[PDB]
Amino acid sequence: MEQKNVRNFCIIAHHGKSTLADRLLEYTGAVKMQAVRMFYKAKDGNTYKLHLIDTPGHVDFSYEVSRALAACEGALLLIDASQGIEAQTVANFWKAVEQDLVIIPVINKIDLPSADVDRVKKQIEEVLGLDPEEAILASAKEGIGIEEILEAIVNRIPPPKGDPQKPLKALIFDSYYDPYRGAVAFVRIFDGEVKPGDKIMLMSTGKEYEVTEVGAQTPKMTKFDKLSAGDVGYIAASIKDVRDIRIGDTITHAKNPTKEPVPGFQPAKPMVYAGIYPAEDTTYEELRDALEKYAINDAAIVYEPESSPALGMGFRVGFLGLLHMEIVQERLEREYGVKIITTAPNVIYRVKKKFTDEVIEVRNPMDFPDNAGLIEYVEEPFVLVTIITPKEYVGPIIQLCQEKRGIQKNMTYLDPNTVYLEYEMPLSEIIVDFHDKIKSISRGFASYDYEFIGYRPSDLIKLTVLINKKPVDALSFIVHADRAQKFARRVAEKLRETIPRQLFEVHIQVAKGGKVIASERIKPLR
Numbered sequence: 086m087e088q089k090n091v092r093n094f095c096i097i098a099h100h101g102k103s104t105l106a107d108r109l110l111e112y113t114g115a116v117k118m119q120a121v122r123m124f125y126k127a128k129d130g131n132t133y134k135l136h137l138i139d140t141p142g143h144v145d146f147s148y149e150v151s152r153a154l155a156a157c158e159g160a161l162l163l164i165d166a167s168q169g170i171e172a173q174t175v176a177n178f179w180k181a182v183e184q185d186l187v188i189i190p191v192i193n194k195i196d197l198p199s200a201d202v203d204r205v206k207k208q209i210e211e212v213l214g215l216d217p218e219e220a221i222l223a224s225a226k227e228g229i230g231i232e233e234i235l236e237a238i239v240n241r242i243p244p245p246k247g248d249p250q251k252p253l254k255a256l257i258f259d260s261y262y263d264p265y266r267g268a269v270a271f272v273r274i275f276d277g278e279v280k281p282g283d284k285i286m287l288m289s290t291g292k293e294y295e296v297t298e299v300g301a302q303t304p305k306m307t308k309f310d311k312l313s314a315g316d317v318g319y320i321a322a323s324i325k326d327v328r329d330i331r332i333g334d335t336i337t338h339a340k341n342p343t344k345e346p347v348p349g350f351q352p353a354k355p356m357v358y359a360g361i362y363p364a365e366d367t368t369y370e371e372l373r374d375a376l377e378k379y380a381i382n383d384a385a386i387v388y389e390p391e392s393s394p395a396l397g398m399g400f401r402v403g404f405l406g407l408l409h410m411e412i413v414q415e416r417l418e419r420e421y422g423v424k425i426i427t428t429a430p431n432v433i434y435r436v437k438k439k440f441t442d443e444v445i446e447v448r449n450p451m452d453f454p455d456n457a458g459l460i461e462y463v464e465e466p467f468v469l470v471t472i473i474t475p476k477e478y479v480g481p482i483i484q485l486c487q488e489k490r491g492i493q494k495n496m497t498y499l500d501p502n503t504v505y506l507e508y509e510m511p512l513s514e515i516i517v518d519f520h521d522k523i524k525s526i527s528r529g530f531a532s533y534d535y536e537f538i539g540y541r542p543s544d545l546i547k548l549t550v551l552i553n554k555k556p557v558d559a560l561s562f563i564v565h566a567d568r569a570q571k572f573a574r575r576v577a578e579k580l581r582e583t584i585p586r587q588l589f590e591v592h593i594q595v596a597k598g599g600k601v602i603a604s605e606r607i608k609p610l611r
Contacts (some may be wrong), residue, residue, distance in 0.1 A: 093157045094161070094242055108225065116263070123303075144176070166195045188215065253341075261327070262326065274314055285338060331352060354404030356404070358403045359404070359410060360402075379416060379417060452523050453563055455547070573603035
């Protein structure tokens with residue numbers, strides 16, 4: 086098995102990604118699935134070593150998607166025959182292009198009555214600028230497209246380039262914690278070779294380890310004698326935790342190190358925070374214990390203890406985004422059976438106060454200065470939002486983005502009935518209810534994606550929530566001055582419905598620097 090007969094690819098799709106991977110394995114052969122090695126004898130008679138790299142889909146894991154892409158030579162771009170191209174589809178397309186990958190468009194679900202292949206092919210040509218003729222048609226239920234897919238991989242994706250004799254240079258594109266093998270890194274070997282007993286080094290840290298095991302999923306985790314230039318597999322080396330083998334980092338040899346690391350390394354970057362407190366019977370200790378265990382399998386999550394006068398003790402947890410938050414929540418409740426209450430999420434604000442030289446990073450609203458007079462300026466993160474929707478919903482969506490302080494930067498037609506929109510919007514407005522709103526007004530037909538584009542100064546203020554003339558720190562939030570009144574009313578009306586009834590009247594107030602701007606009351610229990 087030579088390196089010229091190796092094919093490194095990944096599947097990119099929101100649109101039946103997992104299914105395809107299964108069909109691919111069954112056809113060839115018959116811990117999360119990753120770095121799968123398959124053997125395939127093509128029509129040309131030769132047998133090929135194929136490596137399938139699993140990639141995440143959501144924008145929250147954008148950096149991780151890019152690192153996985155940088156480990157491949159090609160990608161199967163899955164597009165649903167009915168939906169056609171979506172915002173994620175376009176975003177992922179460009180990231181693949183960005184990593185010089187050969188893109189193989191795969192239109193699946195061709196069987197559905199709603200399917201419209203000709204339309205999708207048209208989009209592939211006009212929007213992606215690819216050859217509609219090179220698109221592959223697939224259908225799980227009918228069982229077609231696999232051989233054609235495998236053949237396209239062999240014939241269209243170039244083999245890996247790298248020298249097995251040069252110093253080791255392996256890119257880490259994923260990882261997980263193994264209770265027996267320790268923290269395991271899923272890697273792509275560009276140069277050199279690695280084998281058990283080797284003394285390796287992590288280039289971003291300079292930390293060294295002794296390899297204990299190497300291999301790949303076949304689909305079971307199988308140990309190999311080594312991994313060489315072009316290979317995709319895993320490496321174990323008595324590594325204490327997944328934060329020591331950060332995605333995007335380069336693994337080389339301690340004594341004979343490669344010249345430069347793979348470019349593009351970036352540490353995990355939390356973007357959305359929320360307070361998490363124990364609920365029902367769950368105690369603080371149990372929540373903390375749960376977070377510690379979970380964290381062992383999540384290299385991106387951060388958290389620290391915090392307290393509220395009403396909620397008690399909890400944690401200010403930082404996530405990569407809303408899905409990541411959702412994933413953590415469900416796993417804490419499911420895996421560890423803990424009951425938790427989560428505050429409204431918030432972004433990281435940068436505040437410049439009068440008597441403090443350095444700008445302060447606020448990840449907890451209650452840490453935002455109470456004294457507005459002391460604030461010289463506040464900046465918040467903005468993102469570029471791309472949206473794809475049927476023409477019928479364009480107006481309602483535009484109005485929505487506009488209400489959320491969005492600035493339109495572009496509008497284009499992806500076909501006579503499909504519109505593409507680009508909007509610069511504050512991330513703070515996006516994490517409130519944008520997702521459910523855009524989905525309801527589009528009947529689930531509109532899609533969107535976004536990219537961080539930097540911080541910008543804004544007229545932001547802190548609002549406090551008082552329950553019975555006395556405030557509750559955990560409910561304080563940051564809002565744009567112009568949206569204050571509206572957010573205040575919404576938050577108040579929400580609490581009037583949220584909290585139950587008591588023997589006494591429950592007065593809810595939302596104050597802006599001392600003055601009340603929203604009031605709501607819950608009459609006595611009766």
